[PDB]
Structures are given as C-alpha cells and as structure tokens.
Amino acid sequence: MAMEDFVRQCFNPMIVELAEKAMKEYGEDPKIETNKFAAICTHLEVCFMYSDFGLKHRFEIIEGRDRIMAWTVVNSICNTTGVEKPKFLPDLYDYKENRFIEIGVTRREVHIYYLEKANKIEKTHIHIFSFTGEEMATKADYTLDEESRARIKTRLFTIRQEMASRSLWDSFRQSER
Ligand SMILES: O=C(O)c1cccc(-c2cc(=O)c(O)c(C(=O)O)[nH]2)c1
Ligand SMILES: [Mn+2]
Ligand SMILES: [Mn+2]
User: Fold this and answer.
1) Order of strands across the sheet with 135-137?
2) Which positions does the motif Nuclear localization signal 1 (NLS1) occupy?
C-alpha cells in the first residue's frame, strides 16, 4: 500500500506510533484499514498543531493520551474550574475561554460534519476543518488567530494534494463514515 508508505513518509513518528498504537489495541490493522490510519494521523496532527498555537500554556491536549490519563486530565480540570464533565473525551481544553474543544476534520462539507458532531454531544466548543480551507465553529468563534488557522488549513490542503499526487485522494475522499 502506497497509503501506508505515504502515512510513514508524511507524518512525524510520534503521530504515526500513536495512531498505530490506538488502532492495534482495538484489533484494527493499519496495513488494511489504511484510509482510517491516514485520517487518525491527520486528526492528531491538527489537534497537536492547535495546541501548539498556545498564558503560554493556553490549551491542554486531551487527544493522543491513553484513556486513563485523558480522563485524569479532564477530571482534574473539572474539579478546579467547576466546568461540567463531558460524556465523551474531547480533544482540547481552552484555559483562556475556559471550555473544552472538539476538533473535527472532514473530507465532506463543513456544515454537514458540524451537525454530526453537535448532535453526538455538553457545552463543548466545536471547530471543524476540511481539506478545502473551510472551517466551522460554534457561534462562529474560531478561538485562534488567522495565522494559526491559516497554518492548519495549509497543512490539510497539502496532505490532500500529496495524497492526490499519489493517486490516493479519491479513495480517501470517499471513505468517511
Ligand atoms: O468519524 C468517525 O469515524 C468517528 C467515529 C467516532 C468517533 C470519532 C472521533 C472523532 C474525533 O475527532 C475524536 O477526537 C475522537 C476521539 O476519540 O477523541 N473520536 C470519529
Ligand atoms: Mn478526540
Ligand atoms: Mn476530534
């Protein structure tokens, strides 16, 4: 699979390893479910990039932790800010706006995916990125500055074009659940 090669060649090891670990604990093989693997890597990188554009410690990363730590972080945040405990593990906590964030990344229409997220959940803030430079966030509050957002959008467009370059993008486009 070029897709497996592409993942290894275009995302930093930490992300690949985390992605690999997450699939393999739940019986899923990244050599087979390769479009899923790419997607997880993609969502992780975004989650991390979002975090990195932050009070220097603006955001707390929840995604990418093991489940024990993820919950440990979340509870610890709830107990000392008073904020209601979410049902599902979100991606980030915003210490400035003092809310949880759910990051979405979609090959579909941003509004489409936004609804799916809003429906599945809490007073968690939602931010949706697409591979087209489009984004959607609750009450249109985009949390970050334009530069930080431009960098995420550029990284996603680039992943799309690299996939496209390797005739991998049509599979990947059509593979969102
Ligand atoms: O689109 C999906 O296949 C899907 C189904 C259930 C959950 C997720 C998902 C998307 C996410 O963006 C996410 O952050 C998580 C998480 O486990 O923290 N999970 C994605
Ligand atoms: Mn998550
Ligand atoms: Mn997410």
Assistant:
1) 59-61, 92-94, 99-106, 125-130, 135-137
2) 107-121
Measured from the Cα of 105, ligand 1's closest atom is 12
Enclosing domain of residue 160: 1-177
Give start and end residues of each alpha helix (H) in the chain.
2-10, 13-25, 34-52, 67-81, 110-120, 146-165, 169-173
The resolution of the experimental structure, rounded to one decimal in Å, is 2.7
Residues tagged active-site: 117
Backbone angles phi, psi at 117, to 5 degrees: -65, -50
Indicate which residue's Cα is closest to atom 14 of ligand 1: 91
Q: How was this structure determined?
A: X-ray
Within 6 Å (CB) of ligand 1, which residues are found? 43, 63, 89, 91, 103-104, 177
Instruction: Decide: 7 and 37 in contact? Cβ < 8 Å.
Output: yes
Instruction: Check which CATH number belongs to the domain holding 60 and give it.
Output: 3.40.91.90
Is 91 known as a binding-site position?
Answer: yes
What's the number of domains the chain is made of?
A: 1
* Angle, alpha carbons 42-35-124 (nearest 5°): 45
Q: Which of 15, 44, 102 to mutate to test the pocket of ligand 1 (most atoms within 8 A of CB)?
A: 102
